[PDB]
Design a protein around this ligand. Structure first.
Ligand SMILES: *[C@@H]1O[C@H](COC2O[C@@H](C)[C@@H](O)[C@@H](O)[C@@H]2O)[C@@H](O)[C@H](O)[C@H]1NC(C)=O
Ligand SMILES: *[C@@H]1O[C@H](CO)[C@@H](O)[C@H](O)[C@H]1NC(C)=O
Ligand SMILES: *[C@@H]1O[C@H](CO)[C@@H](O)[C@H](O)[C@H]1NC(C)=O
Lengths: 534, 536
């Protein structure tokens, strides 16, 4: 037995597996339980710490994916399948994964904790794009990723109830964070240097740990990729959570909160998922049924209120967006859009897409969006209209929420670094019109281009090495700039005054100013004033 | 007769006239100045439509400009050429309905296209006798017959109690119409062609031209139109019948006049200066680019709002030239926006910007005003004093001129008209206004009229050549309905403005450059978005 692969944690002993990375071996400890299986009476309930076990636990394999909706829009297509569960679905899914250098670090190493996205309705830490072996091997990092409950199982709330209090998926993440504090030193990780990073709902999740005080003692730095806790999709009110929970229950024949939740707990998992999408208040895209709730507990106030009034003095944050945040979502609901054609649309279809794409928008607000995003020199041009549709969805849901967060954090004392990611992977299977879609920076940050069997260009490999360095420098120091390297040029902090951010592409860093400043002023300053009066 | 110049004696329908031979740089021109076209609108005729001038006996002396219509005289910067150039240069009188004709010397043997100038000044000021409106250069260099008329302004031209017989409103426009009828009957005596008449005007003059396009009785009196930095549509060129009535009766109160017959009769007893002294007191809000007595939508001269009439009109056998200067708003900022002056750089604070926007968009709600502020703010430099100053200028110019012109051009083009559009971007070397104002409202006119040709005025040689270019464009358009030269085609062409391609030309010292979209995005804000906000 290899002593590098044998670790004692508080719960007992584990056996990991030596994996081959391109440059050398790594130690992986996969499928480690951090909670009691949240099954039977424990459904919808906060997670409990895993009971200690006897002997040596086999941690050589990824554990089950949390029970979730699986996308079926394009069967057998790698662009969609790469996000689908790659292990069996189960409610028993509260396990985490650790990658370390082989041999394990001689001195305490900065820890990166990955929180996947998927709209709080999907995702898994076992996906090939979240493979931590490259960062471990090349950068010497200790990388951790956890499964958290998604959908009804993670976020169905009857606020104020003891049995479905809400945000339990977020508590799953917090428990994995606690597990790292208590146990990561055994693997050579430094619990006094923990960086959370995540994409999409994962970045929103990272954001919620920033805004929830009990999470704050469990990490030191944060990275939010293409997602925020503020914004239109990441939270609901307690009233809207209750309403959706009560409707889902009706839809499955259930049944006083106690009685309603008891009947929901009797239902086969797939029975809940069958009706998951039927509880949304309007026809929409970029809207998810069961998400974090403003409960007055995990989240003391709305994230908007919390970012406006928080003190973020001793925090460093890396945030950013991809060049084409909205394109990917268009094919999941807006008529005229499809991966299989160029998606050239009419004005009529633009107007209709805006109502679906900004579902809470009133008639007047929807007219303001159309009038702002129309190119009045080319008002009927299908290429313009299609690209504007993408812009509306990406700006409303990601870019402007991100600018808003960056600015508040910066004003309230945080050290902030911002990027836009603009390289389209040579291997991308989505069509050209989608540009650099949501999610397609991740494979570069994780260093997948360094596996020569994946057929990335040598440029893409060098670029991936640049990104791995920015991320791990940031984890190490709270500054993504290389401290032993001179020229570059340097990545400046994002500030409310200068509003500097950098482009991440195959060219050297270029510094730009103003992250869609005019358009986000429309979204962040004008539209709120509109509908709070009308 | 006997000893006088035989080219200076002409008979019109009312009698015999004697003109004057004037010197232009390239040679002599004939001028017939101060020809009366109406009975003096005095006493019981105050506020009343003009009646045609009754024939006179003997030879009327038409050798000097006549009285300027009674008006408010700008007093903000006394001694200063920049303002005095617009001020009255003849005696102020209610007896002011006279017109001017310049023609070549000797008068042309075959009938020549006629240009009729209508001055601006917010419908409260102006005269055809001002030096910037001197027709001699066009007459001499282009062989043009040029006509300009005085029309009543202020209360005298536009005070209305709509529905009344004694103060029906729009009579200043009726003065202009009567001057157009005079040209039809009489211009052939000077060698002018009454079947080729082009109206042109600036500011309120341009608005007036647009209103002659929209008023059917005017349509037989002219064939083509040029609107410079003004339009009949937009926030200032007209008022509703209710607003006219409201202002007329407030004015009456302020001058001691308490049934419309009795009110108007009391107003007719008041000294002219008493009316001028309270003219500005009747505006509903603190404002710039708003004028108390302007054309009224009376359901007669204007059968509907200009907005309605341009959206539904048939303009098929109409050619129109329209444009703007680079900095329409700047001039207006010093007549009411706190923080602004010709004698400093007018760098303003954000607070002054927000305050200025309420004054510059006086009919805007709180929400609309904040939409404006949010649109014009540069969110990279929300507090830069230079950007704020320039944004204030842009707000005022776009709202009042540039976007109404874009709206006008689009409707005209979509409904059959041949439209040619420009932006004029040359700053006169002789301009006395400060540099921050850029190319202000009013400062294309001296070039169209060819003042730079007078070497005593000290324009550069390049400006002389540029004036000659503009004069060709305007007279080519007058001749043919196309500003382009028939022969010369190596030069770059001025393509028509269309809704599809939205093309217009830069007018500056360089050859014509074609550009697309007149402030397309920002005018979508003013012309499409704001009115939808106004609906609730
Ligand atoms: C510029 O002037 C504005 C208008 O007030 C005056 O004009 C200046 C030139 C002086 O002659 C003063 O005596 C006048 O009252 C001011 O309101 C504005 O603040 C000025 N800008 C600055 C900062 O100088
Ligand atoms: C693209 O394809 C989809 C479905 O195959 C269809 O709904 C859409 O109308 C198509 N659009 C174009 C550009 O023809
Ligand atoms: C034009 O220039 C001359 C010669 O220097 C000067 O004396 C005269 O005053 C100037 N005239 C004007 C109109 O400013």
């Amino acid at each position: 037995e290899d002593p590098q692969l044998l670790v004692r944690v508080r719960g007992g002993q584990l056996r990991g597996i030596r994996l081959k990375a391109p440059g050398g071996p790594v130690s992986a400890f996969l499928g480690i339980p951090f909670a009691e299986p949240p099954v039977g009476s424990r459904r919808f309930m906060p997670p409990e710490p895993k009971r200690p076990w006897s002997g040596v636990l086999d941690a050589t394999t990824f554990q089950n994916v949390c029970y979730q909706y699986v996308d079926t829009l394009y069967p057998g297509f790698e662009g969609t399948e790469m996000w689908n569960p790659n292990r069996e679905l189960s409610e028993d899914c509260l396990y985490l994964n650790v990658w370390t250098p082989y041999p394990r670090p001689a001195s305490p190493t900065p820890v990166l904790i990955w929180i996947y996205g998927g709209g709080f309705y999907s995702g898994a830490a076992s996906l090939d794009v979240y493979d931590g072996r490259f960062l471990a091997q090349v950068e010497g990092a200790v990388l951790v990723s956890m499964n958290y409950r998604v959908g009804t199982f993670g976020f169905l709330a009857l606020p104020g109830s003891r049995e479905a209090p809400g945000n339990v998926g977020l508590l799953d993440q917090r428990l994995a964070l606690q597990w790292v504090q208590e146990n990561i030193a055994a693997f050579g990780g430094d619990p006094m240097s923990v960086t959370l990073f995540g994409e999409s709902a994962g970045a929103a999740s990272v954001g919620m740990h920033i805004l929830s005080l009990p999470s704050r003692s469990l990490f030191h730095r944060a990275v939010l990729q293409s997602g925020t806790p503020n914004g239109p999709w990441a939270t609901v009110s307690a009233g809207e959570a209750r309403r959706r929970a009560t409707l889902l229950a009706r839809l499955v024949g259930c049944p006083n909160d106690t009685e309603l939740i008891a009947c929901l707990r009797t239902r086969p998992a797939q029975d809940l998922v069958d009706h998951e999408w039927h509880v949304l208040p309007q026809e929409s895209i970029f809207r998810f049924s069961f998400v974090p709730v403003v409960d007055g507990d995990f989240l003391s106030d709305t994230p908007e209120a919390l970012i406006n009034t928080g003190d973020f003095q001793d925090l460093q944050v890396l945030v950013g967006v991809v060049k084409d945040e909205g394109s990917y979502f268009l094919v999941y609901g807006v008529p005229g859009f499809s991966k299989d054609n160029e998606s050239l649309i009419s004005r009529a279809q633009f107007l209709a897409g805006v109502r679906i794409g900004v579902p809470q928008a009133s008639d007047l607000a929807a007219e303001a969006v159309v009038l702002h995003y129309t190119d009045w020199l080319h008002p009927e041009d299908p290429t313009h209209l299609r690209d504007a549709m993408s812009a509306v969805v990406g700006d409303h849901n990601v870019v402007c929420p991100v600018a808003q967060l960056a600015g508040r954090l910066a004003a309230q004392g945080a050290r902030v670094y911002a990027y836009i990611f603009e390289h389209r992977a040579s291997t991308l299977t989505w069509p050209l019109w989608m540009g650099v879609p949501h999610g397609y920076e991740i494979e570069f940050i994780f260093g997948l281009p360094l596996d020569p069997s994946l057929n990335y260009t040598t440029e893409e490999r060098i670029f991936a090495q640049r990104l791995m360095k920015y991320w791990t420098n940031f984890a190490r120091t709270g500054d993504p700039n290389d401290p032993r390297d001179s020229k570059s040029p340097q990545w400046p902090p994002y500030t409310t005054a200068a509003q500097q951010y950098v482009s991440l592409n195959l060219k050297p860093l270029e510094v730009r100013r103003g992250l869609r400043a005019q358009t986000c002023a429309f979204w962040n300053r004008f539209l709120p004033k509109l509908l709070s009066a009308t």
